[PDB]
Structures are given as C-alpha cells and as structure tokens.
Design a protein around this ligand. Structure first.
Ligand SMILES: CC(C)CCC[C@@H](C)[C@H]1CC[C@H]2[C@@H]3CC=C4C[C@@H](OC(=O)CCC(=O)O)CC[C@]4(C)[C@H]3CC[C@]12C
Ligand SMILES: CC(C)CCC[C@@H](C)[C@H]1CC[C@H]2[C@@H]3CC=C4C[C@@H](OC(=O)CCC(=O)O)CC[C@]4(C)[C@H]3CC[C@]12C
Ligand SMILES: *[C@@H]1O[C@H](CO)[C@@H](O)[C@H](O)[C@H]1NC(C)=O
Ligand SMILES: *[C@@H]1O[C@H](CO)[C@@H](O)[C@H](O)[C@H]1NC(C)=O
Lengths: 701, 701
C-alpha cells in the first residue's frame, strides 16, 4: 500500500518536540486560521471551533499592554512573506497577560508559490519580566507564571535551572527547536511520495524487482548444478566453472547486504523506513540461514594450500548450497495469487525434482557396482545393465570404464522421468535391494506430484470456463422455460436473440454490481462519465451544478433497445422521461406514424408541472439499435426539490420532443375519401340520443 | 450482432452532403410533419417541438408575397404522389422573405404503398432576385442574403464564384444532389437487412461457414501428411499425390482472396462494410503469414527443369506448410464457448501430436543407424531392435533394408501413444543418447497434455452435474431439518413429495429469475402469454385494454396445488382472488361441502367494493392437481385505480363463484333428527339470561 500523499501535519508533529502552533491561509484576506493543535488550545484556553476563522496575527488575543509597533511589524512580515521571531505580550480567555515567542514561517507550494502560514508559540513569562493587573501577591503571580511555562523550562531546558544566565543559552536553545522547524516546515503541503532515507532501496522498485529475478535465476542454476557436481564428479577440471561459482557466491553476498538495507512490509505497518529496525527484523527472520548458504568454499580452499583431509571434507560441505532456494518464498507469496504462473512453477519443480532424483539414482548406481572390496561387478544394478545394452561393457588389465559421463546422466534423467510421469518404459529399471526401495519412494513421491499438477490444471480450466459456463446454463434454463410454457415460435426466438445480444455487448458484466463495488464519489464520477452524452449535448444540463449533475447521474439508467422493440405501449404508465443519445425511434398512434425521434431528442411527460401519472397516448417503437438514457420521475422530482434554483432553469430549458400525455387530432385520407363518396348517395329516433347529446354538452363545461 | 432494421434517417444523412429536410405522414389529413433535422431548424428558425404537427406544405411559413398558384401546385403534387421541384418565397420566424428550392419526394413502403413524404430545401436568395420589406440599405440586404445562403454557395458551388452564369450549371448542380437524394430517398422505411456491397461475402453466412469448415479439414489433412512426407519419404512416386497437393495449394490461394473480400467484426464496430478498409485490416493482421504458407512449391519445381541443388533445397521449404493451421484460430474463438466440443478438439490435438512425435521418432531412428561413415549398424537404436523383433534384420552384398515402410510408421505411432498416454509397454523403448532425451521431452509434454485432457473432462462432468447436485443437496438439507425438528411422519412426507413434484414439473427453473433476466416489454408479453387461460376464458377481461392486461399480467402469480392440499383455511386473511384455469376444488364450512369449483371458476372476495380485509369463512381444499391463477388485492386495486373506465366494467362482469367472506346458514340432518326425537320427551332462572337476551336484541339494531 503506497501512494502520493501530503503528510503535512505528521511531519510537523514529529519535529515539534512537544510544542504548539496554528495554520492560516496566506492568499485569503485577514489571514484566516484554519487549524490549531491541542497544545495551542491548552495554552490559549479556547476550543478549536472558536479559534478558526480568526486572524493568524491574533486580534482577539491583543489588549491594552500589547505593543502596537510589534503588531505593525508582524503585519508587515505577513504582507512580505518572511521568516521572523518576535516576543509579544497577549491575553488569554481568562485575561492573564503572557509573553509569547512567536516564530512565524511562510509555507511554499509544489507550484513554488506561497499558500499557507505557520506560527509556533512559546511562553516567556518567567523568563522575560513580571507584570500583573490583579494578583493575591508577587509570589502567587510567579507561581502562576511557572505553571504556565512548563513546556520550555520542564523538558528542553532541564539542565538550565542549575546554571545561571538562561537568556544567553537556554531560551535561545529553545528557539533553536523552532529554527529546526523552519526547515521541517518546508514540506510545502504538496501531494508527495513517501520519504525514505538514503542508502536504502524500496520494496516495490523496478531495480529491486530485477535484482530479485536475477537472484531467482541464480538459485535455479545452483539447484540444477550443485547436485550434478556432487554426483557425476567433474572434479574441477576447468577453472572457469570455479570462477563462475565464486561469482555466484559474491552475488549472493551482495544480495544479503542489500536485504539488510532494503524496506519491508508488515501486517499492520505497510511501509518500514527505520534502517536499524529493518536490520534487526532481518536478523530475527532469515539472516543466519542465508549467510550459511552463501560462503565461498572453493575460494577458501584455493589459497591456504593446506591438509588434504581438511580440503576434501570441506568440499563435501557444498551440499548446503541446495538450501539457497529459500529466496524463492518471496515470489511464491508474490505470484501465488495468479493461476497460470502456478502451473509453470509446478512444471519447473517437476523438472528440478527429476534432475535431483536422477542424480541420486546415479549416486546409488556408483555405490552399488563397487560395493565389495573383492571387486565384484555383480551381474546386476541398473548401471551395469545400461552398459551391457548401449555397448562398451567393463573389463580389466585396473578397471576400464564402460559408458560415457554425459550419456549416463541423460539415461538417469530419463529413468527418473519415467518413474515420475507414470510412463514406466523399463529399459532402465530397478533390480537390487536399495535400488528397488529408492524406486518405490520415487513412485510414491512422483504420483503425488503428478496428481498435484493435474489438480492445478483442472483448477485453471475451471477458473476460465466459469464465466461462460454459467451463461450457457442460464441460456439452457431459459430455453427449457420457453419449451415448458409453450411460448410462440417468434416471441421466444426474439427473447433468445435479446439474451444473446446482451451477452455479446456486455461480455458478461453486471454494471450495477460493478458500481456497487466502487465507493460513493468514484461511483458518482463513473455515472457522470456514462451519461456524458446526455449532459454535454442537451441545453437543460449546461446550467446545472456539479452536485446536481452527480445526483442526476446516480438515478440515470440506460437502455439498449433492439430494432422493432417498443419502449412505451399505448395505455402504459409514463413514469420516466427518456433522452435519445443515439439511434432512431418512431411514435405510432392509431397505427400511424406521428413523430420520428433521432439523436439528441427527448420524450416522456412533464412531471414537475402537471404532477400526476398519465396514460401513454401512443406506442413508441425503435427503428435501429437505439441507446436510451431514462430517469424515473420520482427520483428526478426529488432531485429538483433538492436543487430549487435549478428546477426553474430546467423547466425553462427542457422542451420535450414529444409528450406521450397529449392526444393528436387527425383523420386518415382513405376515410375522408369514403366520406366524400358517401356524400353523393343520400328525427323520430332523435329523443333517446338527444338526452345523450345534452349530457355530453353538460359534461363539456 | 445483426438484425433486420429500418435505417431510414441514417441513409438520408449519408446522402445529404450537408443539407436539410423534413418528414410528414402521407395517409394522415393535412400532411402532418413528424420530423425535422437540425439544419432545417437552423434555417427556418424554429425548435423541433413547434415545427411538428404542422402541414408539410408549410402554411405557417407563407405570407403576402408568397404566390398562391405555386402553393396550389404543391398541394396538387401532394395529392397525386409525385416527385417535383419548386422555387417558392416564404417567411421565417423573424419575418425575412426567402426563396426555397423545395425538392418534394413521396416514399413507398415494403408493402409497395406510399406512406411518408420527404421535402429537401435550399436557399435561392442571392441566386434568384432581391426583394425586401424593410432594410438599412441594399448592400445590407445583400449581405444578409449571403449569410443565409452559405450551404449551397460555400461548399458545393465553391468553383462557381469565379466563373459566370451560375444559374446555367451551379444551381442546377446543387439541385443534382437533391436528384441523387430521390434515389437515396427510396429506402421505403422498411425493416430491411444490412446493406452490403456486391463482390463481398458475409461473416456469418451458410456458404462462408461451409468454406471455413472445408479449410479446417484441409488444414488438418496438411498437418497429418506433410510431416509424413518429410520423414518417411514417399519421394513423389505417384503424381496423384502431387496433383492433390497442388489442388490444396490452389484452394488455399482462393481462400486468401476470399478473406481479402469478406466482412469483419471489431469490438466497437459489429459489422464492417468498407472493402478497402477490410483489405487493409487483413494486411495488418494475418496476410503475410498466410501467403507464406500457401505457395505451390511442387508446381514451381515441376516446370523449369533446372538445378538439382536448387530443387532439393527448395523441396525442404515444404516444412512451412505446418504453419497452415493458423486458420484454426477462427473456430477456436467460435467454439471455445461450448464445453463438449473442446474435448473433441483436445482429442484431435492429441492424435495430431502423436503423429508428429512418431514422425520425429522415425527421423531420429533414420539419423542414428547410419550416423558414421564407416557404416556401423551399432547393435542399438529402437529401429534396429524393432527389425530384430518382427523378423527381417539388416544385411549386405550395398545395404538391404529390414522392416517395411508401412509397419515402421505404425510402430512409431504406437510408441508415441505409449509415451503420451502413460501406458509405457516398452517393446519399443529409448536406448541411445539423443533418443533418450527425446523420450524424456515427449514424456514431459505428454503428461501435461494428458493432465489438460483430464481437467477438461472433469470440468465437463461438473458443468452437467451442477444443476442436479445442488437440488440433491437441497433435498438432503430439507430431510435433515425434518429429522432435527422431529416433524411428524405424514407432514414431512407430504413436504418431501411436494418438493420432488415441483422439481419434476419445473425441471429446475426459477420462473421469477427468468422473468427478471428478460427486459420490461418482453417480460410483460411473457406474463400475458402465461395467463392466456385467464384472460381469454373469463368475461371480465375481454373488454380490458392491452395496457391494462399487461399491468395485470405482471402482478398475476400462478400456483400448482396438490390433491388434498388446502389453499385458504377458515380464519386466514382473504387477500387475493384466485381464478381456476384447471382442476377441481371443494369448499368446506363446518366440515361440510358447500361448493365445488371447477374449470373457469373464481373465488376470493370483492375488495374494490367492500374495501376491508375479511376473515376466510371456510376451508378450501383441492381435489386434483389444480392450477390456480391468483392476484394480490393491493396490486389489483392499484391497477383498477389506474384504469378508471375499466374498473366499472370489471365490477359489472366479475361474479365470484363463491365469496369466502359470507357465512352460509344451514343445519345438518342428523341434528334435526335428534331434535325431532327430543321433541316427544318433555322461568325462575330466566332473569340472569333475560338481561343477556335484551343486550343481544339491543346489539341487533
Ligand atoms: C512434492 C510436494 C511439492 C508440492 C507439494 C504440495 C504443495 C501444496 C500442498 C497444499 C497443502 O494444503 C497440502 C499438501 C500439498 C498438496 C503439497 C504436497 C507435497 C507436494 C506435492
Ligand atoms: C501442449 C499444449 C496444448 C494445449 C496447451 C494448454 C492450452 C491452454 C492452457 C490454459 C492456460 O491458461 C495455461 C496453459 C494451458 C493449460 C496450455 C498448456 C500447454 C498445452 C497443454
Ligand atoms: C556373472 O555372469 C556371467 C555370465 O554372464 C558369469 O560367467 C559369471 O561367473 C557371473 N559372475 C559371478 C560372480 O558369478
Ligand atoms: C554387435 O553384436 C554382435 C552379436 O550380436 C557381434 O557379433 C558384433 O561384433 C557387434 N558389433 C560390433 C560393431 O561390435
């Protein structure tokens, strides 16, 4: 957990050394106080609420005995933006005069300009001189003064009360804390990176990551080669290999040193910046093992030119270099979260395992064929069999070797692989006592390893199919439902198409869920972004405030209607106006097209004015794949109520492209023609209908 | 994403060339305007709202200087349905006279009839002649005219302001855009298919799919055979094989060409219709590799009759034909969504892998046995062993061959299969250096492949058992619960039966969930379909409107009651009337059957009239598997309130088959008999009861 943050207060607190201060805005008129620490409150005798919004020069704290010249000077300093210190008399809430050592400082910004102020205080009551308006005695006054001035005289100037002339050194020294602050009060209130000391590298750096990678590679190499060295016995013919080993050792040593320096992450503490502490932690955790791993033994052997027994035995100690793979637990934790890399890791392990077991097998073979001092080749073991098979058996004249050093290793590896992978060819196969046991052991291990690999693979398969399989299942269910309730061929098909289409468009993402997952402000922002086509285009929302916009966005849905898929049907409740950001719709009343609705159009019903739910007078079908942005009336109404000044503006602006409330008066042409035709062709039953007519007339008014 | 859509506006916009227009309904009287683009609005000086519903001839735009004859002509044209162009003077909102080149056009339909109108406009102010009612000067007027007529004179007629006599060519040319429109304004407002140009085939066609399938097959064939050719060396004995290869190459070439033409789907753009663009895209993506794959090398070799070195080397280049399987990534994306086909694909891959590795093995064998120039058969390799085994070893007189060309391949394949499948018989088995390494490699590959297959199988198994296993678990849980709370033997059993029965009926489908998954209108339609047995049968809903019906459907539940499973119990709240679409129920009051309720019956309580929740006066049991359609009173009430005219009708129509509110007055026959019997057998304590009687009497009034 790391990010750019403006840790301003914290730094000041750290520097403090148990001192008090206040903060004020520079660019605002009268220098208004915006913050005060608890110490200051304790001192002055005011709460944080009543202190804020007052002038930073402290107009409320002045009185009769306060010097005007000093105040003027302070004002001048404020105007000019300058670091200064002043001794000045001021009153408290309870009206007791106190001398304050006011150390002013202007704070710069990340844009190099002055923005905030700082002003630290300190009591110079007992130090400067005694004055009192009303008191029980002089002694009492003195006592009171002493009580007041505890922070300076108590903890910082605690070697001073024995030695005389504190004004020469002690007060000045105390002021030196403030002076230090002057540097510690230049963090500039800037959203900066986490401050780490020099001679230390970060936990999450690029360089560090590269180094880690390199170390991993080295460890892998060591794992590969050390066992080979142990078993097949190259016997350091070439010095190049030795040199390489030495280099590796050196690198390991360097890495150890780096580790001591570098930063760490705890469960509570996300970043640790203390070097000594980190060193201690390292020592506690993993130092000893690491150090044991990385001693350059070859180098040590080379120089002294001493005992043979001492040397050979020492060489044997190289077995411990296998423990170097302890570094791998850093990325194990760093890369276990991923699914796919785990498989790779497993594969690598398998390879390594095969190598190791091959080496062991070779060693066993070596042990077996010259076990007895009588020098019996024993017609058995795997190695002998191999020799017999590939040509070049064993003979004497001494003991002449059979198979080549390179081939043998390969053979061993093959055997190991067979054992592991459950193939089991059996060209090379276990015959002897120890050998058979070893084989059994490897099989036991091997099966488990294989099983684990399989499991991992299965899990991987599951965790990519899960997103689509669920969808498939859903689709199947829908189909079954349709089959069951015997839905007509067309409607069902349409539904299916819609379902498919949504999946194609979204790629399996619930928008609401995503929104929920995001926090409040972020969610609002996202919503705003989504409805940018609404707010930027239409004239209604250009005047709208930011808060208002945010509010609107939360309530705005969005609908992707298909071609020939009607939104509002004649009779249905008009409960939401709908903006058309794209596509094209048609409005059909009495099976006749009354209105086309294209890009940047609106329809629904004016709710805020009429204040009643109305029937939809006409059908509204969509022509193309039309994107609509709709909002439920109630929510909209609420929003309008909240933002009263905006409501009027909205009313003025938002002209609906077509109201679904209003009827349209019209006749069809065919009907008219028919009427005309009839015209050329052509009292007692008027009384039953006359009454009706009268009633109608009455209703009309 | 493709569907039949009436992209009417878009086509017009495309044709436009920065021009304005309005749309009006032909069949409606007075030719009402239903749409106007932004350009038109800008020109005339009106919003879209006030323009709509006016006459398309523009009665509001006329004035004093407007010619009546022209208007009459326009009217005549409208009446007759005819394409014409007219120059006519009209006013704007601000009352400035303007000459408009009004290009009228009637729009046909998919049913061949005329339905909509079009009428494009263009400013002929500066072009025709100058007239003004009020003006500052002539120059000013001219300037204004110029300002007005920018679309024609600015962009279309931009080579015209140098050359004289613009009325001869320029105006006419401008009108030619309109003329073009006349063709581009014959899309007919028909829900048509997506318009694609000729010489291009669709992405999702039947023919295209077939072609793709064929290509896949060809690729498979190539994968099978090319390696065989490389390894076993038929040496083109027959020309038939060569011919086949040539044919394949030709087909591939054809496919490439087809690909250049054919359509494409992007992430944003669902269909691409531009040919050049598609070609470019193809070039960017996959052209080069494909072209490299498909050169007919054999053909090239055949004709020239040139160098042997040149030929043989060239032949070697056929290795690249393995890369032809790049076509497979089209169906990989198309068929990864399915679970079952993936298994098949994997199997195919496995087969192919086995083939390939067999070929490699054979090659290795070939390399090995005559490695040295001394011609040493070396008593080893797999091939030699095989020869020794099946009869016919090697000999000389030259070098006579041992095993047959057909058998060997088969043997190799078998070996490969053994390696892969983890069987490992070991008739054929790795003995030599390179060979052993190869074997190891194959084992490493093979195990992984096998594991993947296993994983896939497991996933498949999971994704069909998941629907039923959950159900089983649920059942188990229910059983456990019953066991725990010690529910009586009968009730528990009944519950279990019900649970089973529901599962049997539904086949594991939550109806509500399905409904939710569907969108609004679709959902409503589905609901309506479901309650077709209600609405079509009963006389209540025949008069009901469509919107009303829709509203009702949303609120209508449906219940599948078992035999002997009572719905309403005496005392329970009657909060929902219930229609019986099927089955048969009995109503039991005081342990006596008062009413049978069969098909097309109703019961519950009249809510809308009485307006109070009442106790159920009697039990209501079901006889058979009865299907009920019920609706909660509150929802129904709301619906009724919404549709006021319908409510009265509903009240008039809906006669409940039996009210659960009302008591029935009756005596049992046995009781009567008893009373009668008693009759033949047979004042001071009247005063305690007299008071009670009096009270009762009082209550009565
Ligand atoms: C052999 C080692 C290498 C990785 C090991 C596995 C790594 C992780 C786990 C998860 C753990 O939980 C159970 C043991 C198991 C399967 C281990 C068993 C022993 C394994 C197979
Ligand atoms: C051998 C190839 C053929 C298919 C491959 C697999 C296809 C898909 C995936 C999913 C991927 O995620 C991890 C690797 C894996 C298992 C591949 C590993 C290597 C495999 C087994
Ligand atoms: C090993 O077997 C060989 C024959 O293959 C034989 O001559 C020999 O005596 C055997 N070795 C021993 C120690 O018995
Ligand atoms: C191969 O083995 C045979 C006996 O099976 C033998 O006669 C021959 O000499 C061996 N070949 C070589 C090159 O040693």
């Amino acid at each position: 957990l790391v990010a750019p943050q403006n840790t301003f207060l914290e730094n000041i607190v750290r520097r403090s050394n148990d001192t008090n201060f206040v903060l004020g805005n520079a660019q605002i008129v009268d220098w208004p106080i915006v913050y005060s620490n608890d110490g200051f409150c304790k001192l002055s005798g005011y709460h944080r609420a009543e202190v804020m919004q007052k002038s930073s020069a402290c107009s409320f704290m002045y009185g009769e005995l306060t010097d005007k010249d000093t105040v003027e000077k302070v004002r001048q300093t404020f105007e000019n933006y300058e670091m200064n210190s002043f001794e000045i008399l001021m009153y408290k809430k309870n009206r007791t005069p106190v001398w304050f050592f006011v150390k002013i400082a202007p704070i710069r910004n990340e844009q190099d300009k002055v923005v905030l102020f700082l002003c630290t205080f300190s009591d110079i009551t007992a130090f400067k001189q005694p004055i009192e308006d009303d008191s029980c005695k002089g002694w009492g006054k003195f006592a009171r003064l002493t009580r007041a001035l505890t922070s300076s005289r108590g903890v910082l100037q605690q070697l001073a009360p024995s030695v005389q002339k504190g004004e020469n050194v002690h007060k000045h020294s105390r002021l030196a804390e403030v002076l230090q602050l002057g540097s510690d009060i230049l963090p500039q209130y800037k959203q900066e990176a986490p401050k780490t000391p020099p001679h230390i590298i970060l936990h999450y750096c690029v360089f560090k990551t590269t180094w880690d990678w390199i170390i991993l590679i080295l460890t892998f190499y060591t794992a590969i080669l050390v066992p080979y060295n142990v078993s097949f016995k190259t016997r350091q013919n070439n010095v190049a290999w030795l040199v390489v080993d030495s280099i590796v050792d050196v690198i390991f040593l360097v890495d150890i040193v780096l580790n001591f320096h570098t930063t760490f992450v705890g469960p509570a503490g996300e970043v640790i910046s203390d070097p000594k502490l980190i060193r201690m932690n390292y020592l506690k955790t993993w130092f000893v093992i690491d150090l044991l791993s990385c001693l350059p033994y070859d180098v040590i052997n080379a120089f002294e030119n001493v005992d043979e027994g001492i040397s050979s035995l020492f060489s044997s100690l190289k077995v411990v270099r296998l423990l170097r793979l302890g570094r791998v637990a850093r990325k194990l934790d760093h890369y276990i979260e991923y699914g796919a890399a785990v498989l790779v890791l497993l594969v690598c392990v398998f390879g390594l395992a095969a190598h190791w077991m091959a080496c062991i097998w070779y060693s066993i073979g070596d042990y077996e064929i010259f076990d007895e001092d009588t020098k019996t080749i024993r017609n058995n073991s795997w190695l002998y069999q191999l020799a017999l098979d590939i040509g070049t058996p064993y003979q004497f004249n001494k003991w002449e070797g059979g198979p080549s050093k390179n081939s043998v290793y390969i053979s061993s590896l093959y055997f190991t692989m067979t054992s592991l992978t459950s193939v089991g060819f059996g060209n090379i196969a276990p015959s002897t006592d120890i050998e058979k046991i070893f084989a059994v052991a490897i099989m036991m291990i091997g099966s488990l390893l294989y099983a684990t690999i399989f499991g991992n693979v299965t899990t991987i398969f599951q965790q990519m199919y899960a997103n689509t399989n669920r969808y498939h299942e859903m689709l199947n269910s829908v189909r079954d439902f349709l089959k069951l309730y015997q839905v007509p061929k067309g409607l069902s098909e349409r539904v299916m198409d819609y379902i498919v289409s949504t999946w194609s468009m979204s790629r399996g993402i619930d928008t609401e869920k995503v929104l929920q997952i995001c926090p409040k402000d972020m969610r609002a922002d996202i919503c705003v972004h989504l409805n940018r086509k609404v707010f930027k285009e239409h004239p209604a929302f250009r005047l709208a405030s930011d808060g208002c916009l945010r509010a609107l966005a939360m309530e705005f849905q969005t609908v992707h209607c298909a071609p020939g898929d009607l939104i509002y049907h004649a009779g249905e409740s008009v409960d939401s106006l709908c903006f058309v950001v794209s596509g094209s719709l048609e409005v059909i009343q009495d099976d006749e097209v009354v209105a086309i609705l294209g890009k940047g159009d609106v329809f629904g019903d004016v709710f805020w004015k009429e204040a009643t739910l109305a029937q939809s007078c006409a059908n509204v079908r969509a022509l193309t794949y039309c994107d609509l942005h709709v909002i439920k009336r109630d929510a909209l109404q609420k929003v309008l109520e909240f933002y009263t000044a905006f409501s009027h503006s909205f009313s003025r602006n938002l002209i609906l492209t077509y109201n679904l409330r209003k009827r349209i008066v019209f006749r069809k042409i065919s009907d008219v023609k028919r009427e005309e035709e009839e015209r050329m062709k052509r009292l007692p039953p008027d009384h039953p209908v006359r009454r009706l007519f009268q009633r109608f007339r009455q209703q009309k008014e």
